């Protein structure tokens, strides 16, 4: 049987694979549903990963992780995992095509992803002024005006944050009400760098071959239109954790999760189930940065190594 | 005053400085007691930092971190900090020569240090076959022989860990009995790849250009000098956390610590003191890897940014 099954090949899974294998686990298998590297791969540039000084596309950034993380004997399975279950004191991995794999320990490194909006120009201008990460990209817009789209905590919090960097922030929402914490909303209503554009819809993201120049918006109260000139547009429209592999046949969850579906872990990346670990954007309080995910992967692998030593 | 004072310029403080400064903190100051990079600087070879494909000394590995982490406005003070104290709603940073600095927030990123033995050859060979890190260096002696010095749980755990990677592990201790949990001693004694050398004392560590090649050892009962040929020597003789900066005039500690001196934090690198955060080997459950310290720094800076918005 597999000693350790790593589900997901982003930074968390790749680091887990590096560490497990370098730590003497002889049969570690990384499961990836096609295209190693994870979310960063959609980025046109990453510059805040500590210790890598060259600014380069997410795909180029991740590509040396392939030969390094596989250098010490890691194996691959190219397949979408459907489900992980507990069986006696081990685990069963069910592949979506119906094949099965058993493993002594499992690391869930399945991450998540930002909801998209499907507004016209979103895909065309993505990385040229359309963004999903204020931490990653907010600094490029240092003395400028920027727009934020969204209704919950992340949207309002990110508008406060960008208001600290940018000359001005338009906060665009379809409703006068925000599905977020009321005190954070009060801070934003009392921050003079944030103009609220409510109730609005973004009808098109417009610009030229260098990226965004403006948004076509409509007030749904009056239907008056407006062309809003901004180099930067941040969308914070919800996040989906890739939970699905946790769901059992009787619809129960494999391990304890928080009320948003993230997996509960302690500082050693352990879940409440013995021999099951989690790492990356999938776990509670994940800061959602590559270094963070990589760190989790390393610490989960170290935990696996101790676990296999004792069982 | 200073927005954020970062105490320590190892991977933790470096990445905290990167993130804080890229996240819009206009006056972030890094305090370093002379020569950033931290502990890895003493190693002749690092290979397990995810995303960095070339194997390279610690000095060379850390060089690009200086350029990158200082690229966004980060300031420094080259001074040994003697104390951090709380005063009103801010912090007072007392330098060892009596200079004082005030800051709104503080990140403790002071790391730790293994205890050294002083066995002739310990400096000459430090990070060149003499190691304090089984995780970091074990894989180099993959199918090779190795010695471990120490009597606690950690010498004993690390010798079991190494026995799963190396052909043979010599476990050297100054007496016949051990300070570790009885159960873990049991496990060692049934580990056929682990050879106890007890009551022994290592008399000399010898090598050449490529590093450690042998140790001069001596049976303390018998007085026979063995010469032990091995290319790798691990030393687990204790660890100290760089706590000192936390001790107040009254002898109390600024913030909550565990039994060993490590600073208590939550998942967002928050201590129990408002405005005070910690990152790296200084904190509870730190794995003691560069990627982990760097992740704690990023997330401590992220918490600093939210704190400075609120306050
Ligand atoms: C557009 C964009 C830009 C970003 N820019 C930066 C940046 O500049 N700096 C930074 O630090 N971070 C950035 N991030 C955030 C960063 O990408 C994530 O924090 C990081 O990738 C999380 O790593 P992970 O390993 O936990 O998950 P992921 O990267 O999400 O990867 C999980 C992997 O598992 C695979 N998987 C999922 N489910 C299954 C399954 N059922 N079976 C088999 N495989 C499965 C997926 O295909 C995926 O490859 C950016 C993110 C995005 C989306
Ligand atoms: C021999 C060895 C080999 C290692 N190999 C690896 C490896 O291969 N891979 C890996 O990932 N990790 C490795 N590590 C562990 C890694 O180096 C540490 O985990 C990492 O450096 C911890 O980072 P840090 O920022 O918390 O602290 P440190 O690296 O210890 O940095 C703390 C910094 O704070 C400064 N400081 C302390 N006190 C004060 C003060 N009073 N005032 C001002 N400045 C102060 C120190 O001078 C130091 O620069 C190794 C460690 C050792 C000892």
């Amino acid at each position: 049987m597999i000693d350790c099954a790593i589900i997901g090949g982003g930074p968390a899974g790749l680091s887990a694979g590096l560490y497990a294998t370098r730590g003497g686990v002889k049969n570690a298998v990384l499961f990836e549903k096609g295209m190693p590297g994870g979310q960063i791969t959609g980025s046109s540039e990453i510059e805040n990963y500590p210790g890598v000084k060259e600014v380069v596309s997410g795909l180029d950034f991740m590509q040396p992780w392939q030969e390094q993380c596989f250098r010490f004997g890691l194996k691959h399975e190219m397949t979408a995992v459907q489900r992980v279950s507990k069986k006696d004191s081990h685990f069963v991995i069910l592949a979506e095509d119906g094949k099965t794999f058993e493993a002594k320990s499992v690391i869930i490194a399945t991450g998540g992803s930002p909801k998209r909006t499907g507004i016209k120009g979103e895909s065309e201008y993505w990385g040229k002024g359309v963004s999903t990460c204020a931490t990653c990209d907010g600094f490029f817009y240092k003395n400028k005006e920027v727009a934020v789209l969204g209704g919950g905590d992340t949207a309002v919090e990110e508008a406060i944050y960008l208001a600290n960097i940018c000359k001005k922030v338009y906060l665009i929402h379809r409703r006068d009400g925000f599905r977020c914490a009321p005190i954070t909303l009060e801070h934003a209503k009392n921050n003079d760098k944030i103009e609220f554009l409510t109730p609005y819809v973004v009808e098109e993201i417009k610009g030229d071959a260098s990226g965004v120049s403006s948004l076509s918006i409509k007030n749904t109260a009056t239907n008056e239109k407006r062309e809003l000139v901004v180099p930067g547009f941040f969308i914070f429209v919800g996040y989906d954790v890739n939970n699905a592999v946790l769901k059992q046949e009787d619809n129960s969850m494999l391990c304890k999760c928080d009320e948003y579906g993230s997996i509960v872990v302690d500082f050693s990346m352990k879940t409440n189930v013995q021999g099951l670990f989690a790492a990356g954007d999938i776990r509670i309080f994940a800061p959602k940065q590559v270094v963070c995910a990589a760190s989790d992967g390393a610490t989960a692998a170290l935990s696996v190594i101790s676990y296999l030593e004792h069982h």
Side-chain angles (χ1 to χ4, degrees), chain A:
Chain A
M1 171 173 144
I2 298 176
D3 304 319
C4 179
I6 307 162
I7 324 294
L14 297 157
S15 320
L18 179 48
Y19 272 73
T21 241
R22 225 185 149 266
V25 177
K26 308 251 268 296
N27 192 2
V29 184
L30 187 162
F31 297 77
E32 172 48 50
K33 67 145 100 127
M35 262 274 325
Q39 291 169 74
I40 194 55
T41 261
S43 152
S44 50
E45 82 179 293
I46 169 155
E47 90 177 352
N48 66 355
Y49 181 83
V52 183
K53 69 182 268 189
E54 84 175 337
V55 175
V56 135
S57 89
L59 233 10
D60 293 346
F61 171 78
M62 283 301 293
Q63 102 84 44
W65 293 52
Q66 294 298 139
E67 107 63 49
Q68 176 195 21
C69 297
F70 282 85
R71 195 177 305 147
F72 313 97
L74 188 58
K75 308 172 236 279
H76 306 82
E77 262 292 323
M78 211 228 267
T79 203
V81 174
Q82 179 171 338
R83 177 185 302 137
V84 175
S85 313
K86 196 59 169 237
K87 172 140 195 285
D88 317 311
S89 296
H90 66 263
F91 303 81
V92 177
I93 301 98
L94 171 75
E96 251 167 32
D97 88 331
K99 300 196 215 180
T100 253
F101 301 78
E102 290 180 297
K104 195 176 195 206
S105 59
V106 168
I107 308 173
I108 313 284
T110 230
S113 70
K115 304 189 176 178
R116 298 196 164 274
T117 231
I119 293 150
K120 181 184 209 315
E122 176 189 66
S123 156
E124 183 183 342
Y125 290 115
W126 183 276
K128 270 180 279 257
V130 171
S131 177
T132 242
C133 188
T135 282
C136 307
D137 284 306
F139 202 71
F140 308 133
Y141 294 103
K142 184 167 174 173
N143 285 281
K144 305 176 184 107
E145 324 196 308
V146 114
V148 180
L149 205 218
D153 274 292
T154 150
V156 181
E157 293 312 327
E158 290 322 333
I160 102 231
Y161 166 87
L162 289 170
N164 207 46
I165 285 153
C166 291
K167 157 196 200 88
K168 218 250 216 95
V169 181
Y170 308 78
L171 181 52
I172 305 180
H173 190 37
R174 55 136 79 224
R175 224 135 37 209
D176 271 300
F178 291 80
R179 284 178 309 253
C180 86
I183 206 323
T184 102
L185 222 226
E186 302 183 1
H187 290 320
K189 295 271 188 188
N190 303 315
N191 193 306
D192 336 315
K193 256 107 103 30
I194 292 191
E195 201 177 315
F196 277 74
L197 286 201
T198 299
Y200 288 69
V201 166
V202 176
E203 311 272 54
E204 175 169 29
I205 308 157
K206 279 179 154 267
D208 48 57
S210 41
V212 174
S213 36
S214 65
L215 306 172
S216 308
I217 59 179
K218 193 211 282 175
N219 194 314
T220 72
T222 349
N223 34 330
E224 268 321 311
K225 296 165 166 17
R226 173 173 180 187
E227 193 185 64
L228 198 80
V229 170
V230 287
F233 173 45
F234 289 92
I235 4 231
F236 299 113
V237 114
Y239 188 89
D240 307 311
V241 138
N242 286 342
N243 251 1
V245 77
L246 305 190
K247 197 164 147 193
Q248 303 307 291
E249 271 147 68
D250 66 6
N251 282 320
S252 73
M253 298 277 95
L254 218 206
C255 60
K256 199 184 172 52
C257 294
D258 87 347
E259 53 196 282
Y260 303 107
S262 291
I263 304 167
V264 187
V265 304
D266 62 12
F267 266 120
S268 69
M269 298 315 287
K270 281 179 172 155
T271 73
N272 62 311
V273 177
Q274 254 200 312
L276 178 74
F277 310 84
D281 287 2
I282 190 66
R283 61 70 166 190
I284 62 177
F285 304 112
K288 273 124 111 333
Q289 292 291 287
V290 174
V291 241
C292 294
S295 182
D296 285 358
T299 144
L302 289 178
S303 285
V304 155
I305 285 155
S306 309
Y307 183 80
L308 299 170
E309 188 43 57
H310 313 138
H311 315 74

